[PDB]
Write a protein that binds this ligand. Structure first.
Ligand SMILES: [Zn+2]
Length: 423
């Protein structure tokens, strides 16, 4: 079955699963001189890099901002993740979260999909051939030793140490059916709480109706799975973050409006807000993806004259019929796979399978200060049950209640600078 590789941060370089990686974004001016960074292959084609994400315009400065703060629940600390002990803690936390995801069939299948679903390569001399859209470089002493396959690289957080995000490497392949390598910025220890109505908590006797909005922490496996759903969209080349869904009209628009949400986030979160999408929208999204794939099969796949392992990978990713030089899209099987990746795979549906509580709506009504939690302590967080550990009376979402003892308060200043954890 799918295997998760364990590592300690001080494990030696071997060129197989432990490398020093040149940043995928090394050619951008903002990234001159950065790296290489120690990287660990946790699952085939999935790499963990215990470093702050610092490689795009909006993540390049990790310092406390010098401009109006427009995320009132952010926490800044440019020194987080700069010691070997914090890097090993991060590595262990990501490994443990992935082990949790693998512990249910739906999560195992998601990880298998990301591992196997390589971007569609370019063709050279009749053969599918690898590019930097499908690989990372092992750099040693300013030489490239090898190029290793990669669909996903997971880093630590950007400037806001409690934020999470996904970035596709190349912007044309992210939305034209080819797909692109993805980077994820993830924080397993610094979490942003949310509100949900609940009635099983200590309450004053003079309160008649106890069922009210209470504060909860997310399970960081749900946080990561949300980003992994974005990754799947990026690997199949079916992202488009230029569309907004307007809740007032039920229509897709190409600019943000009063009461709207980026459509990629509406789908990736799922839940109640995706249950009333019109048939017009669904048909247009499916038809766009089908047309993009039909074009790639005729213009690129049918120029392949060399059968190699990359072609094997691609036929497992893309449902096709026919023979070399004359493939056609398998419409029924492509439709089934596409509707799974767009409408079945989402944070809300996955959380239900894991007995994890998530909020009702992607957009939160108010900011709540982040907390710190040591998820490596099995008494607080287990791979099989997360925070909601039955033997400790914390089933049925109760272990996610924010007043649980393992959720530690963080003090910050008015500029949102980290001061300390209150243990
Ligand atoms: Zn998202």
């Amino acid at each position: 079955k799918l295997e998760i590789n364990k590592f300690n941060y001080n494990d030696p370089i071997d060129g197989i699963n432990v490398i020093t990686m040149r940043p995928p974004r090394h050619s951008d001016k903002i990234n001159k001189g950065k790296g290489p960074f120690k990287a660990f292959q946790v699952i085939k084609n999935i790499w963990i890099v215990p470093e702050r994400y610092n490689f795009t315009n909006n993540t390049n400065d990790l310092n406390i901002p010098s401009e109006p703060i427009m995320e009132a629940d952010a926490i800044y600390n440019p020194n987080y993740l700069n010691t070997p002990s914090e890097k090993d803690e991060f590595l262990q936390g990501v490994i443990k979260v992935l082990e949790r995801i693998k512990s249910k069939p739906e999560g195992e299948k998601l990880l298998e999909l990301i591992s196997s679903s390589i971007p569609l390569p370019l063709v050279s001399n009749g053969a599918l051939t690898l590019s930097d859209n499908e690989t990372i470089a092992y750099q040693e002493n300013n030489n490239i030793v090898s190029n290793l396959q990669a669909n996903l690289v997971i880093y630590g957080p950007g400037p806001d140490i409690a934020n999470n995000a996904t970035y596709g490497l190349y912007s044309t392949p992210i939305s034209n059916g080819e797909g692109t390598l993805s980077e994820v910025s993830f924080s397993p220890f610094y979490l942003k709480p949310f509100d949900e109505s609940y009635g099983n908590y200590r309450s004053l006797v003079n309160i008649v109706n106890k069922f009210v909005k209470r504060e909860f922490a997310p399970d960081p496996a749900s946080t990561l799975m949300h980003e992994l759903v974005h990754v799947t969209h990026n690997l199949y080349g079916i992202s488009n973050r230029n569309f907004y869904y307007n809740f007032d009209t039920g229509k897709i628009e190409t600019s943000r409006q009063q009461n709207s949400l980026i459509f990629e986030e509406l789908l990736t979160f799922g839940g109640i807000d995706s249950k009333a999408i019109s048939s017009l929208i669904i048909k247009k999204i499916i038809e766009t993806a089908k047309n993009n794939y039909t074009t790639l099969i005729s213009e690129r796949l049918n120029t392949v004259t060399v059968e190699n392992d990359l072609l094997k990978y691609i036929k497992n990713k893309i449902p096709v019929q026919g023979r070399l030089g004359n493939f056609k899209l398998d419409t029924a099987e492509f439709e089934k796979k596409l509707n799974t990746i767009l409408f079945v795979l989402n944070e809300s549906n996955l959380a239900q399978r894991f007995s994890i509580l998530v909020r009702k709506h992607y957009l939160k009504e108010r900011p709540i200060d982040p907390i710190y939690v040591n998820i490596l302590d099995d008494n607080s967080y287990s791979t099989l049950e997360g925070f909601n550990i039955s033997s400790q009376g914390s089933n049925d979402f109760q272990g996610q209640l924010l007043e649980s003892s393992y959720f530690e308060k963080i003090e910050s200043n008015a500029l949102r600078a980290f001061i300390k954890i209150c243990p």
